[PDB]
Amino acid sequence: MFDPQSYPYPSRRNVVYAKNGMVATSQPLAAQAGLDILKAGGNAIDAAIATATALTVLEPTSNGIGSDAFALVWTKGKLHGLNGSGRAPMSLTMEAVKAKGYEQELPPYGVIPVTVPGAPGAWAELAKMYGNLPLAASLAPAIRYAEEGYPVTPTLAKYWKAAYDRVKTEWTDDVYQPWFDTFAPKGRAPRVGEVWRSQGHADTLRSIAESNGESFYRGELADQIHAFFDKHGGYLTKEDLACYRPEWVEPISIDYRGYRVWEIPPNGQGLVALEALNIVKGFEFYHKDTVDTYHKQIEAMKLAFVDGMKYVTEPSDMSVSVEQLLSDEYATERRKEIGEQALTPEPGTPTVYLATADGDGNMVSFIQSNYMGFGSGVVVPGTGIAMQNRGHNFSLDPNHDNALKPGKRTYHTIIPGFLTKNDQPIGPFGVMGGFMQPQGHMQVMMNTIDFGLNPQAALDAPRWQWTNGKQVQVEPTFPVDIAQALVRRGHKIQVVLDEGAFGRGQIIWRDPTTGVLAGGTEPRTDGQVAAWEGH
Amino acid sequence: VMFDPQSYPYPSRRNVVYAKNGMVATSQPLAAQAGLDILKAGGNAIDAAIATATALTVLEPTSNGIGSDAFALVWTKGKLHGLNGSGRAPMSLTMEAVKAKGYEQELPPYGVIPVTVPGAPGAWAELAKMYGNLPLAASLAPAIRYAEEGYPVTPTLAKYWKAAYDRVKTEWTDDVYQPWFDTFAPKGRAPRVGEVWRSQGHADTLRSIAESNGESFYRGELADQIHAFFDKHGGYLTKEDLACYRPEWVEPISIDYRGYRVWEIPPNGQGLVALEALNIVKGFEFYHKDTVDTYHKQIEAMKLAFVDGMKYVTEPSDMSVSVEQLLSDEYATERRKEIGEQALTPEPGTPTVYLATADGDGNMVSFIQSNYMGFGSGVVVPGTGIAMQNRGHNFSLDPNHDNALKPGKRTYHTIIPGFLTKNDQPIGPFGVMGGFMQPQGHMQVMMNTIDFGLNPQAALDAPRWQWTNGKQVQVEPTFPVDIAQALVRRGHKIQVVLDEGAFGRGQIIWRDPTTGVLAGGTEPRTDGQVAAWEGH
Amino acid sequence: MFDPQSYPYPSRRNVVYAKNGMVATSQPLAAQAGLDILKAGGNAIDAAIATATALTVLEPTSNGIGSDAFALVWTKGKLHGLNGSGRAPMSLTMEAVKAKGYEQELPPYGVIPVTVPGAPGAWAELAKMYGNLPLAASLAPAIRYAEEGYPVTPTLAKYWKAAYDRVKTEWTDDVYQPWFDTFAPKGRAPRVGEVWRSQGHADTLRSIAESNGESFYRGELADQIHAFFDKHGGYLTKEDLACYRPEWVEPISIDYRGYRVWEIPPNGQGLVALEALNIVKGFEFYHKDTVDTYHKQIEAMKLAFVDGMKYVTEPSDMSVSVEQLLSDEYATERRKEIGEQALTPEPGTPTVYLATADGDGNMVSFIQSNYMGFGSGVVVPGTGIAMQNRGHNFSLDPNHDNALKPGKRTYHTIIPGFLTKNDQPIGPFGVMGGFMQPQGHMQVMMNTIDFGLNPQAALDAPRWQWTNGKQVQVEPTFPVDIAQALVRRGHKIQVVLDEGAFGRGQIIWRDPTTGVLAGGTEPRTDGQVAAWEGHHH
């Protein structure tokens, strides 16, 4: 025909402004769900749950009902942290998986890497504690979308086709059949403009709506989940699900140049961003686009990431403390290792993202994932519960702190961020993308606090990410002269052409004086910041 | 001193928005929201257009008013229809009455004098009655809600609102201009960023036309309030001028451009210019967009057609030549012979808010309305928030010109909604806001789409040029510099223009005729949105 | 201090114009040499030799006296081709190297991959046949530079340091010592601004100046070369050098849209450019920067390159003929394999570059190399002859046409190009860079003929290069939308940040009517197009 997927010219996104409410996520109809709930008398928390459950249907390539979730919610002048990360099955031990062939790392797919999905319970607890509407109100649009269906956008279509084509050959087992029945019902991944629906998704969302998430963990859905896993030699039981509860946990922070940057505590990997900011804190910058600036950024991130990967796990099984990693003298210790040449990083010593705000000062940073795309590939039949494969994050080295243990929850990549200044809330941020996440967090924090970029500009800005040792990937739009100067300083810089390899961000900032909401959305994908101005 | 300005150091990306059951694309994201809400409540694309149009009346007052006139191309039931919602000159407004008052070159931009009958309210009503599903009171309720409750002012809207205040605080010291300051500058200044602005006036009158099917505005109580304020300040606008206004269903005109048909509203409206220019340029082949050759032919063909349109286009009755003559293949050939290698001096020959909606049921609308110059005449009928247009300023005061001022005549109109069609299948509405840029923008998106295969967003993203005087062509900062310099060597007085918004605002919705999927593009140079809807 | 190697802003290089003489090369002082020779009554050939020998001293990272060379020279209304490629040692056989451990490919370094350096002989023969000045005049600046020395530019310093740092650890043998003595005399590679000199280089250049190259092959230098190789178990003998002569060979061409694109015939790999152009010839284009255009470019190149790699070697050992590979019906055959998706390429069936031109209608495309950077690492002690590693190109698969044979010369990457229209010369061109070379030839030819770019713009233009199968490297300045559209069509595209990985080019075009010379030089490096406007006679 007469138009492809070609964008020959650069575009502009203006910052979106609101007063009475704002939703910013990666799926425009999901943003619309949050707005619809705001309309029906919901607050920012309600909205978050509306959007989160909507994404469950609208973006199955990054998400599922079988996900776990995390949130930083500001409400009544106080920042709260929700850890909706579920733990490992009680029958899942290191020696049980050792005896099954795998001893390096456990398999990415199948019944083995599945941990208890914590997201549904996180929806319920969020509603019960801080929302205005019952769960059935706030997750109604999600149900509507599942029953009636939606046209598939080109970007969603690509990842859905990629997950089919790779997996049509790799997943030839009984376990994976309901995945093909749910997500590939025509014997192929949905095409652009084709409508996809899931009665399964609708039924189960309705089931958790009417039970306040009880059906999923200690009800009828729990039995269905238990039965399918038992039939296929899985480790996930009723009782594993039954005693899951989302844990209100105390958010951790760093003073970064007057502001306070917030993350969920360990279990989650937000620590890394905090530590990196803390190491980089000691340098001055003044301007963003210098070789100096990207260097110190990159190096500090490197130090903090090998630390986080060594020490961050279930709080009980952590070798050092949060307070030790986040201390000013330990920052100084790591910062002394940053030279002029690109270091090889070593340890030291002692997805869908979503942002909402409303007029009453409520704000939420919400994020949920099946870890690897669709996840484990286990879909409990006829219910559209695509199970996560989060358990893949466990180490099978017994001397590592994140070693696989029954009833333990792993090092988690999903991290919602929040920004605060002088006990005033300024807002939720998050940059989607697995191990990119802390590096994205470091970048948007520095872009905002150091370099004065608006929410959209901060997202627009060209991104880097560290991978291996001296390896750093950069975007096609990364400044080439700086990139080449980094190479001369030892960095193995690769320009990466892949779309979406540098993550997805959303930001909503609130001005503490006037109260006006300013939003930015990820330009690299379909998505929206949307305003609401009713009562 | 906080932590952001209006600075955008880096380039951004807008992906094409896709839908099936409904789409709205306009320059104010809450206006787009209104049309979505109407689609939700069981409205079709026409309903949504009206929803959005009336919403813009409140949400973007710097480009609009209730006292606007309007135009639409609506595709419904396999047929394209044209609505001419342009109102005529007051019956007491004659060439010699204004000649005797001091002005003889052109009539004044501001005051009661250039005000022609606002045709937009009537257009809303007739659109609803004829092709909509919902009563007017349903479809313009969000607009009423926004007027009563108020909205925060975005930086861009704030700039133009402050520009209209600062220039006009000094220029408008008269009794007539007082309600404008009461309505649009109620705190003794133009609203700041993030400040909420509201207008009970706007709400009341929108409700009044909602409940009367527009009758109140033309031959009812509002009509009387309008008549009284004008009579009090020596205006020409009367009850009886308003009373016999009717929007006119008119027959859209087209051109075959490389298989496609490009549609515009017929004269009165200036859409002719784009059509003629496309027709001249038709004779050349292109292959690639970004050459000096391509921009040269574009520019030259546009120049020729524009001086023709300015010479001949007016109220159909007063037109010296016919639409059919100007649009003929042999006349195209005659003008195309005047295109050389050097940049010609163009001579005549011989014989705002834009909005796009589409739904799943195959209804599509190109809708556009304006007060002409920003807020318009500056006449606001007191307590009602009706800012009156200054469209009459387009009339010529040279008696030998076809667009001469005549009582009861409607002028050469800059507002042009476009539509694109292929083999009697609809492909969609498009429009590029911006006064005399409009046909030039129309030419550019049509060539971007048909000749060069750009998607709706990319076509909008593309760097723009616009011809102004003689050899004078303005280009955007992002217009390729090598090509710009090569155009200068060929005689063009090229000027790179740094002004934001000086190159117009576009919206596009294309519909695939086979699959029926909707693909939308929105104007990146301003706040705005393409938004989908997927309910029942 | 207060300035690095940072260039935050884009720059402009205007096309250089001349009438009486022009030299275009990768080292500004080398261009200066060709100008000085033009001054002293020399013609374009003389200037080419001046510049070539100058480069031997001025850019040792890409070159040497132990190089071989190639030339397309236009003089007296006729295009001539010089094959200055030397053959393999007569004692170097497949089974001799098989018995020494290597059987996949022979080693990149040491005495083993050294073939006879053909460049000094090519200099002499070029001078004797078509030059005005004696060799001693034309290579005097080269001598002057070697004796007095020159400040090292940042770019040269990078590759010289890279050659030191990698090789200080890898070259721990007696053979590699004279290299360290010659090219790293201070126990490291020269810094930026540091003067480097070589009395060795001066002595030997003088010795070949005074003998017309005779001393190098069948004279005193020949004896010094033979002795050092015999002392370290090499295969290179006196007698190998003694019966080397440069071979005047007949240039091959293709009609590309009215123009004729010339390359040196087999032995040399220019064939690939020609065949690729011949495949791509059947498509129309109209504009350069479309996904369509790059696709057809890249696909055509791919098919031709696997052909050239299969068949091109010493003419006598070639399995098919040049005429078959360059035929219109075989072009058609390969062009049918070009689809919409990116193909996996399979075979079918039946460095320093330099350009000079003068007022009297003489023009030369000249190129010489040690193959891999400094070459083999063998430097004959105290003489500064860095020996090439060209024999590394030979295959050790007996069924391959380019199999190692004694006295055979290998598939050669160095390719000088010439462009012609209706038996009028338009000029010399080349794009440096190993296996990039034919791809660079295809790009400048299409940039010139198809897309009407000036010599400088043609060189400025962003570049692609194919490597493996579906693997294509592109420049940071390669348009991103097009790149990603190529990926959707199956190409494994990689943006490569490396400076200089996409070659160095020079172009001089002569207008056949007016006679005015228009020059372009490689912006990615140090270098110059320079004019000369004085008098002969």
- DSSP per-residue string spanning B494-527: EEE---TTTT--EEEEEE-TTT--EEEEE-TTSS
Whether residue C86 contacts residue C407, with contact meaning beta carbons closer than 8 Å, is answered with no
List strands edge to edge, sheet with C517-521. C16-18, C517-521, C505-510, C424-431, C417-421, C259-263, C252-256
What does residue A256 show for φ and ψ, rounded to 5 degrees?
-115, 95
Give me the DSSP letters along B439-488.
HHHHHHHHIIIIIT---HHHHHHS--EEE-SSSEEEE-TTS-HHHHHHHH
Element (H, E) at A338: none
Separation CA C300–CA B211 (nearest Å): 70
β B529-532/B22-26 pair status: antiparallel
Q: Is position A296 within any domain?
A: yes
Separation CA B346–CA C257 (nearest Å): 38
β B472-475/B493-496 pair status: parallel
Test the C interface: residue of A158, A290, A497 with most C CBs within 10 Å: A497
Element (H, E) at C71: strand C68-75
At A443, list the tokens: 């970048």
HSE (side-chain half, CA atoms, 13 Å) at A474: 26
SS3 A352: strand
What is the DSSP code (8-state) at residue B318?
A: G
Q: Residues in chain B, how many?
A: 536
B146: nearest Cα among A31, A535, A360: A535
Separation CA B376–CA B370 (nearest Å): 8
Q: Which domain holds residue C287?
A: 15-537
What does residue B427 show for φ and ψ, rounded to 5 degrees?
-110, -30
Whether residue B443 contacts residue B278, with contact meaning beta carbons closer than 8 Å, is answered with yes
What does residue C401 show for φ and ψ, rounded to 5 degrees?
-65, -35
Beta-ladder partners of B420: B262, B428
HSE (side-chain half, CA atoms, 13 Å) at B235: 30
Residues of C within 8 A of B288 (CB-CB) are 286-287, 289-290
At A80, list the tokens: 């709260």
At C88, list the tokens: 């393999």
Q: Is position A133 within any domain?
A: yes
* Neighbour count for residue A90 (Cβ, 10 Å): 15
Question: Looking at chain A, after which residues does the C atom sit over 2.5 Å from the next written N, breaking the chain?
Answer: 350
**CA C338 and chain centroid, separation:** 29
Q: Is position A281 within any domain?
A: yes
Separation CA B39–CA B61 (nearest Å): 24
Residues of A within 8 A of C6 (CB-CB) are 291, 481, 485
* Neighbour count for residue C154 (Cβ, 10 Å): 12
Q: Under an 8 A CB cutoff, do A148 and B534 touch?
A: yes
Separation CA A13–CA A16 (nearest Å): 9
Separation CA C205–CA C196 (nearest Å): 17
HSE (side-chain half, CA atoms, 13 Å) at A273: 37
Q: Under an 8 A CB cutoff, do C7 and A483 touch?
A: no
What is the nearest CA distance from A289 to chain C, expressed in angstroms? 10
Q: Is position B11 within any domain?
A: no
What is the nearest CA distance from C404 to chain A, expressed in angstroms? 37
Partner chains of A (3+ C-beta pairs under 8 Å): B, C
Residues of A within 8 A of B155 (CB-CB) are 14-15, 17
Whether residue B383 contacts residue B201, with contact meaning beta carbons closer than 8 Å, is answered with yes
HSE (side-chain half, CA atoms, 13 Å) at C374: 27
Whether residue C114 contacts residue C299, with contact meaning beta carbons closer than 8 Å, is answered with no
Q: Residues in chain A, how many?
A: 535
Element (H, E) at A210: none
Whether residue B432 contacts residue B461, with contact meaning beta carbons closer than 8 Å, is answered with no
Q: Under an 8 A CB cutoff, do A11 and B10 touch?
A: no
Separation CA B56–CA B74 (nearest Å): 19
- The identity of residue B55, as a single letter, is A
Nearest to A457 among B8, B154, B458 (CB): B8
Q: Under an 8 A CB cutoff, do C481 and A7 touch?
A: yes
Q: Is position A10 within any domain?
A: no
Cα C534 to Cα A476, B175, C37, C38, distances in angstroms: 48, 82, 11, 8
Separation CA A127–CA A135 (nearest Å): 6
SS3 B80: strand
Q: Under an 8 A CB cutoff, do B287 and C289 touch?
A: no
Test the A interface: residue of C292, C484, C488, C524 with most A CBs within 10 Å: C484
Phi-psi label, residue C188: left if phi above 0, alpha if psi -120 to 50, beta otherwise: beta
Test the A interface: residue of C480, C486, C491 with most A CBs within 10 Å: C480
In sequence order, the 6+-apart residues with CB closer than 8 A to the CB of B345 are B470, B471
Element (H, E) at B255: strand B253-257
* Neighbour count for residue A134 (Cβ, 10 Å): 14
B372: nearest Cα among B107, B37, B36: B107
Separation CA C343–CA C337 (nearest Å): 8
Element (H, E) at A507: strand A505-510
Q: Which residue from A minimizes the CA distance to B531? A: A28
What does residue B40 show for φ and ψ, rounded to 5 degrees?
-55, -45
Whether residue A30 contacts residue A354, with contact meaning beta carbons closer than 8 Å, is answered with yes
- For tokens 């307070």, the residue is A323
Alpha helices for B105-173 (secondary structure H): 120-131, 136-139, 141-149, 155-171
* Neighbour count for residue C270 (Cβ, 10 Å): 33
Q: Is position C4 within any domain?
A: no
Separation CA C297–CA C283 (nearest Å): 10
Question: Looking at chain C, after which residues does the C atom sit over 2.5 Å from the next written N, breaking the chain?
Answer: 350
Q: Which residue from C minimizes the CA distance to A495? A: C495
Separation CA A304–CA C10 (nearest Å): 36
Q: Under an 8 A CB cutoff, do C480 and A497 touch?
A: yes
Nominal resolution (angstroms): 2.7
In sequence order, the 6+-apart residues with CB closer than 8 A to the CB of B497 are B474, B475, B476, B477, B503
Angle at Cα B193 formed by Cα B187 and Cα B198, nearest 5°?
Answer: 50
Q: Under an 8 A CB cutoff, do A455 and B4 touch?
A: yes
Q: Residues in chain C, how many?
A: 537
**Burial status of residue C323 (CB atoms within 10 A of its CB: 0-12, 13-18, 19 or more):** exposed
At A426, list the tokens: 């300024």
Whether residue B439 contacts residue B416, with contact meaning beta carbons closer than 8 Å, is answered with yes
Whether residue A108 contacts residue A389, with contact meaning beta carbons closer than 8 Å, is answered with yes
At B66, list the tokens: 């209730």
What is the nearest CA distance from B40 to chain A, expressed in angstroms? 11
* Neighbour count for residue A520 (Cβ, 10 Å): 29
Separation CA A398–CA A407 (nearest Å): 16
* Neighbour count for residue B405 (Cβ, 10 Å): 25
Element (H, E) at A272: helix A271-280
A80: nearest Cα among A366, A441, A313, A352: A366
Residues of B within 8 A of C286 (CB-CB) are 287-288
Torsion angle of C-alpha atoms B243, B249, B253, B259, degrees rounded to 10: 150
Give me the DSSP letters along B4-24.
--S---S-B--PPEEESSEEE
Give me the DSSP letters along A398-455.
TTSTTB--TT----B----EEEEETTEEEEEEEE-SGGGHHHHHHHHHIIIIIT---H
Q: Under an 8 A CB cutoff, do A17 and B449 touch?
A: no
At C49, list the tokens: 């030799």
Structural domains of chain C, count: 1
Element (H, E) at A125: helix A119-130
SS3 C340: coil
Using the Cα atoms of residue B184, residue B187, residue B190 and residue B194 in order, give the sign of their dihedral: negative
Helix/strand/coil (H, E, C) string of A296-323? HHHHHHHHHHHHHHHHCCCHHHCCCCHH
At C58, list the tokens: 């001025």
Q: Is position C47 within any domain?
A: yes
Whether residue C47 contacts residue C23, with contact meaning beta carbons closer than 8 Å, is answered with yes
Q: Is position B386 within any domain?
A: yes
Separation CA C49–CA C362 (nearest Å): 14
Give me the DSSP letters along C420-448.
EETTEEEEEEEE-SGGGHHHHHHHHHIII
Separation CA B280–CA C505 (nearest Å): 43
Separation CA A505–CA A524 (nearest Å): 9
